[PDB]
Amino acid sequence: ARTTPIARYRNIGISAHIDAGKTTTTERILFYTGVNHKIGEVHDGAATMDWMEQEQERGITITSAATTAFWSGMAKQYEPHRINIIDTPGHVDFTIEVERSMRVLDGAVMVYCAVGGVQPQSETVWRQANKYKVPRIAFV
RNA sequence: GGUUUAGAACGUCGUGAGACAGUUCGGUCCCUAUCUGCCGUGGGCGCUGGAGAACUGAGGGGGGCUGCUCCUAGUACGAGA
Ligand SMILES: Nc1nc2c(ncn2[C@@H]2O[C@H](COP(=O)(O)OP(=O)(O)O)[C@@H](O)[C@H]2O)c(=O)[nH]1
Ligand SMILES: [Mg+2]
Ligand SMILES: [Mg+2]
Ligand SMILES: [Mg+2]
Ligand SMILES: [Mg+2]
Ligand SMILES: [Mg+2]
Ligand SMILES: [Mg+2]
Numbered sequence: 001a002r003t004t005p006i007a008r009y010r011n012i013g014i015s016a017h018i019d020a021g022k023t024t025t026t027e028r029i030l031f032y033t034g035v036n037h038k039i040g041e042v043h044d045g046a047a048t049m050d051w052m053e054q055e056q057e058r059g060i061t062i063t064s065a066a067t068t069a070f071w072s073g074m075a076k077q078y079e080p081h082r083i084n085i086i087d088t089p090g091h092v093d094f095t096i097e098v099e100r101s102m103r104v105l106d107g108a109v110m111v112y113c114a115v116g117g118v119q120p121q122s123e124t125v126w127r128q129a130n131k132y133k134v135p136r137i138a139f140v
Numbered sequence: 141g142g143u144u145u146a147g148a149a150c151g152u153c154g155u156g157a158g159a160c161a162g163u164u165c166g167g168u169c170c171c172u173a174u175c176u177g178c179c180g181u182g183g184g185c186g187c188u189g190g191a192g193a194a195c196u197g198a199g200g201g202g203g204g205c206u207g208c209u210c211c212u213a214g215u216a217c218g219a220g221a
């Protein structure tokens with residue numbers, strides 16, 4: 001019946017300031033789980049999540065897009081977990097979208113830049129996550 | 141080709157011949173370079189005995205233009221775009 005046990009389900013979001021690497025980190029996720037044959041770059045519009053023509057041309061995420069993966073482990077340590085990742089936007093022009101995805105998800109991976117670190121949109125996603133008390137981790 | 145020759149016509153001016161910063165069609169553009177100048181190329185002599193070659197280098201000339209794509213780099217800057 002149920003393909004994967006309830007414990008092996010992750011509904012996660014990738015939230016942070018504009019251009020912290022969120023859309024790339026999602027491409028490298030879809031790559032290390034084999035679902036996409038090409039790595040693709042955000043600047044060259046190759047990114048699958050950036051499907052809208054505006055997203056391809058301007059290299060920005062103007063919407064939330066959802067994808068799935070099967071991450072066994074680094075050494076196949078665990079049984080394949082079905083991670084539902086909905087890539088989100090960081091532009092203040094689209095905050096409803098990040099809160100929209102943020103509410104349902106059980107965890108958030110907050111991207112950051114090593115040069116800048118805490119940025120305005122990073123505080124914005126922080127306050128939004130804190131009000132909904134989502135458990136968080138961070139990726140620099 | 142235009143402008144300004146001789147032909148002809150329009151409009152206008154004049155009685156007229158003709159005329160118009162008015163127009164219209166047609167209408168002969170010569171020279172074998174003496175000298176300077178310049179581009180080449182040699183003959184004479186000189187450089188102190190004659191000759192063959194290899195050069196130094198004062199000086200002179202030639203050349204000096206730039207686009208686009210990628211890497212750095214979505215890097216610095218920018219809340220962003
Ligand atoms: N140097 C470098 N550039 C990165 C890295 N991750 C992403 N980028 C680039 O930085 C830009 C912004 O990243 P992106 O994933 O589009 O951010 P998002 O729009 O917030 O999801 C894009 O041109 C990416 O290719 C990284 O680790 N290093
Ligand atoms: Mg993005
Ligand atoms: Mg005659
Ligand atoms: Mg010269
Ligand atoms: Mg010279
Ligand atoms: Mg580029
Ligand atoms: Mg950019």
Ligand SMILES: [Mg+2]
Nearest residue numbers: 057058059221
């Ligand atoms: Mg723009």
